[PDB]
Subunit: 425 residues, 3 copies
Amino acid sequence: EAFTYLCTAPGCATQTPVPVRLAGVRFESKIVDGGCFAPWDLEATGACICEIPTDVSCEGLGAWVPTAPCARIWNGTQRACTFWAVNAYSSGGYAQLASYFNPGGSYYKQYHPTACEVEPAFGHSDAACWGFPTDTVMSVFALASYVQHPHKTVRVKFHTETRTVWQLSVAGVSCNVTTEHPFCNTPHGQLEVQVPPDPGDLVEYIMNQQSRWGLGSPNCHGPDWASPVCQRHSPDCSRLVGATPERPRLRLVDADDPLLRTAPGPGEVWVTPVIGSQARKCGLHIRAGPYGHATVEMPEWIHAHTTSDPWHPPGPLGLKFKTVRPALAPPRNVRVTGCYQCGTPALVEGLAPGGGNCHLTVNGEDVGAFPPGKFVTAALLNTPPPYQVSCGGESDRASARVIDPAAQSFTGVVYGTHTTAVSET
Amino acid sequence: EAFTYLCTAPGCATQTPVPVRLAGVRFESKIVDGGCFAPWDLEATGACICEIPTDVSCEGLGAWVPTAPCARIWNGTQRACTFWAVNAYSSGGYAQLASYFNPGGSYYKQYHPTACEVEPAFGHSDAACWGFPTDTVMSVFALASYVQHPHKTVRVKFHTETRTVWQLSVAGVSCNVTTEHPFCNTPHGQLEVQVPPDPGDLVEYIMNQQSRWGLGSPNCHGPDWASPVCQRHSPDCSRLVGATPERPRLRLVDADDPLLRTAPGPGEVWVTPVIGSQARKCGLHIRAGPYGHATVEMPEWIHAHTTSDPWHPPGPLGLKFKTVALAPPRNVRVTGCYQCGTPALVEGLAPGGGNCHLTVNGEDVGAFPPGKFVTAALLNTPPPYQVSCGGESDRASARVIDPAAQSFTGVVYGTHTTAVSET
Amino acid sequence: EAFTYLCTAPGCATQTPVPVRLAGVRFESKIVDGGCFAPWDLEATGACICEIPTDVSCEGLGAWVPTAPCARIWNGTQRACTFWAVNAYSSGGYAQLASYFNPGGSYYKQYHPTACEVEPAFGHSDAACWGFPTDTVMSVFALASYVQHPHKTVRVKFHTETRTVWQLSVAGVSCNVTTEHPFCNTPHGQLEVQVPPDPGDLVEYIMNNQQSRWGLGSPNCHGPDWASPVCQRHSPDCSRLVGATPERPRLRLVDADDPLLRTAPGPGEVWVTPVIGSQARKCGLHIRAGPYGHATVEMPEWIHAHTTSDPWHPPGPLGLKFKTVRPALAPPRNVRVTGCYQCGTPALVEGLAPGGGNCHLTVNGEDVGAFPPGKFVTAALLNTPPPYQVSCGGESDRASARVIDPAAQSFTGVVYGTHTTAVSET
Ligand SMILES: *[C@@H]1O[C@H](CO)[C@@H](O)[C@H](O)[C@H]1NC(C)=O
Ligand SMILES: *[C@@H]1O[C@H](CO)[C@@H](O)[C@H](O)[C@H]1NC(C)=O
Ligand SMILES: *[C@@H]1O[C@H](CO)[C@@H](O)[C@H](O)[C@H]1NC(C)=O
Ligand SMILES: *[C@@H]1O[C@H](CO)[C@@H](O)[C@H](O)[C@H]1NC(C)=O
Ligand SMILES: *[C@@H]1O[C@H](CO)[C@@H](O)[C@H](O)[C@H]1NC(C)=O
Ligand SMILES: *[C@@H]1O[C@H](CO)[C@@H](O)[C@H](O)[C@H]1NC(C)=O
Ligand SMILES: *[C@@H]1O[C@H](CO)[C@H](O)[C@H](O)[C@H]1NC(C)=O
Ligand SMILES: *[C@@H]1O[C@H](CO)[C@H](O)[C@H](O)[C@H]1NC(C)=O
Ligand SMILES: *[C@@H]1O[C@H](CO)[C@H](O)[C@H](O)[C@H]1NC(C)=O
Ligand SMILES: *[C@@H]1O[C@H](CO)[C@H](O)[C@H](O)[C@H]1NC(C)=O
Ligand code: NA
Ligand code: NA
Ligand code: NA
């Protein structure tokens, strides 16, 4: 027997008793595709209005509310909007008197429907609106939601059962060593490679295509707390699932209100009228408390919280040199059931042929070796259907009922609004 | 030396130099019992009423509100209920005029107590209530809570420090190989088995008794996001702990309100009166936003997100063929918890004659030289504890609590009260 | 070859073929410093007042509200406070009539500003306030927040890539065995030690002088350790809060005979109830609060039961495989270290390894691997702060560094605090 340490860096190589070169470092894993992730981005807009508008919507408020921000925020997740009557019509109009602004504004809404909340704000300062011949007319609109910014959306794949692959060249012969397969054939013997433990789970952040790497689950309780993984989750990059912030809490806060000496809490939006430089016009100052107490800057977060390549321990590898030395037909009636890249092992069943043990592959993925006859195995699959099955020789097409990770995420649940009807007696 | 690969499937066996058969595959772990888990199931009921009821409760509203749903939802977690006066009495009655429905309904509540919120809803459409001799009388009741469905409740045990057990038969002799104990004695010489790494933590979902398996923590951010583990947690299968949704937000939403063009958010319940087919009667349409944006279907979720057996790597195993105190321990004391995830303290006196291969109810906790010993061991068995060095056993002294008791240790459960005195 | 099992307890030793003694057990890890953690402690105070106060603040309500609890709760996280007018002035006063208590109390606030919510509570029982010559005058104040108790605050370091270190004395020579480095030289051979797997991630709870307590795992916030401060309030820099935060407490005025009192308040809910005064123009207040997570955490008790004095390791034994297999360069130059330390993101270490062989590179004594002569680039998880002393096993040199601490890393890639925008007039 012989022994030598092999370093893990590019250029690392040993010469005796048989040369072993470190050709590269890669990894194997059982992928769990989480779909799309993004930060919870609280966005707000509105307008200070020297009028009592009759249509509280983006189109109805087009004369005052910024067009593009209104449309974008209106389409956001957990939308909240409030229309406050600061000083209503003293006479005339159409459902515009102060009496139409009862708490909840049902009287105004009866004649002027809106998806927004309507509230009286009498007693709040109307100083922002000036230049009226008689009484001042003033209202305030606020709109907020959690907007999903495309540039802040990342595709995330969780890597489980991670195995560092130490790509070696043993006297010119390729050998890929892992904790699962640490043996290599040498010209006249066997090489057993002592390897460090695997690094545990990895996080693959995909932006578009470039992949960036995290080490861990991630840990939402540590320095990586602002990871999009810890925030908005969309398995199919369309529909939201799981934990969701409450609808934003909108408040009309006058310029001299002592509340302005404090910061808004997460999800809180405070709006303050600004006196107009023009008659019958006014501005609006907005203060919003971001979810998680901070606004995520995606390129900056990725740059500091990820690496260009997956992490691996420093080594070295222990090369143990020894004088020791250790069915090709396709499998039949193979059926694959479950999901792929999902984290739940799929069921692989079929008939292994004669000649010896079938070293079973499913689209080239090693799922184990089986003696001739019926076999059943639970395998974590990384490839989608169709499935080409082999025992190391010719391949055959397996039968499959396999769903994708997004479909798996929606299996066992009934998505959306749950409705019931209470009948009259 | 000799070498051969042994596959890990049933029927796998090698013949030379010494026959080795794969007898089975099992696992060892340090169990962490989480107690009961269930989905957050938002349930809602109510009624559209062409009257101003004087008793806002399930019994008091029995003439309009469905009986069984009211009683069940009333008993739920984080209950919310609202009674809205759409059109009150114009005259007469008993605390039934519009003036009794001030915001918060304190005037109505003085005469007609209720655990529910009471609010005016004047200005909302009263078209659902018709066939009155003079003015219309109308009210709406909504009730919602997080109901725990017994069929949706699962007992969950987290498996940590998992070790795949490769049960071998080496020339008819049983040998259980793991990453911790990879050696088998043979008369030809010692057999060292190269094994793949362990699979990491497992999740055992228990329904009743059958066990189903998950691989991982679980990951609440991936395809298993709807796992009951990610939702309602009751360590003692009675009291709730940790993360809890807010009380449902009940809203009276008229049939033609533009808000109905959007979906309710999680925990939101929108109630809409339905114009009656009969005089002085009306129906109610309810729209509820489930917690997590979807309703969990337990048998279906378990079927797709779990396996019948714990997962293990495919192998093969590397077979390396090489040519290479029994008295019970005394004064043993066990302190802490079992199946909890915090190592218990095991202390005592190892006897003379050699190293004590210490077992606690058959669980290997290590070997100790003669004399005083102290060890921190993750215990899977409950007290009483039988302690042995490999021979005769003795009864240890124990102060060990169960996983539910551990979950409530270091906390004071329930309402916190304080009294501010007059000066 | 020769083989023997070595137990893992203090004193364990084998004599043949080579003496091997178990000297001790320690651990190596890649530290992730999370900063400060504490339970979410909902605290509440208030007063029942037979008057309409004109200054709703701790100082302004000093005649009724307990001084120290008001000041402490006012400084808490997610503060909520409400002032309810139960029975206002019938005449006179200064912005104290019932008409000043419109919903939201904007009319009262015009003359009597406050950071608190102001609401009418007319119709609620005013029985608690008596002894007035004419009409009763009554108001109620409630104040609640999440107070961070210093004695409940713990510094937490997450330990990743954990490696149990089996400290051995092999024929009198120190050998520290791990899953990464399981070989020891024997007088004229080599010892390969078969070791059990590493225990996975650890949690180090740091209190106060300074004492460390240990958890095994992530932790698991869904199991018996659900009340861990790690599952609660997170402050990376022990000053500013980040991530998940409860909503502002929901304050409710609940009369003594309200059927709602037959139920318990939910998490974050605070119910206040006036208590009839034994003295004229005075009243007490009963407060019922629903703690976050359904329970109040008792820190010394939680730590005592949910942690150990030392990190956990498997019981062993170790497999001693004895074999007959046979048993310092110049410092690196132009070395640069970029990223963070004790953060969980590998830092970039680049430089020039000298000629003469492979450089066994150390960064402040931390092993980062071996590199052939010339340019090298590696991603290493660093546990030590800058400055960085770099070596190939001999003399050391000072590396150039742009390395931030764990608290700075926690705030990198985010813009902290209030986000503002201005909507201009058309
Ligand atoms: C908002 O959503 C509607 C419906 O999906 C779509 O037609 C419209 O273009 C969207 N607007 C923006 C600005 O995203
Ligand atoms: C090792 O991996 C590389 C890259 O996947 C592959 O080309 C090569 O054939 C592999 N070698 C063996 C022996 O499997
Ligand atoms: C509701 O709870 C009460 C008290 O525990 C019990 O008597 C009653 O049977 C329960 N009703 C339902 C429908 O669960
Ligand atoms: C292996 O495990 C089985 C099942 O627990 C047991 O019956 C058998 O005795 C074990 N063999 C040894 C050598 O411990
Ligand atoms: C409250 O905060 C202020 C400002 O930081 C400080 O001066 C005061 O001492 C604090 N009071 C208490 C009781 O913590
Ligand atoms: C083993 O560890 C101890 C403590 O850290 C150290 O003093 C000793 O030098 C180490 N031995 C070797 C061979 O590295
Ligand atoms: C919920 O309501 C919609 C229409 O609003 C559909 O009728 C749906 O079928 C309803 N579901 C149930 C269970 O009644
Ligand atoms: C909490 O209040 C209850 C009554 O509601 C009991 O009196 C209990 O003893 C209280 N404890 C205190 C004073 O915190
Ligand atoms: C937010 O408002 C503050 C003052 O309240 C500052 O003016 C700050 O620059 C504003 N930010 C933006 C982007 O307008
Ligand atoms: C604030 O938001 C408004 C729209 O709501 C405008 O886009 C304005 O320009 C924003 N402020 C800045 C500085 O970007
Ligand atoms: Na006006
Ligand atoms: Na009426
Ligand atoms: Na009065």
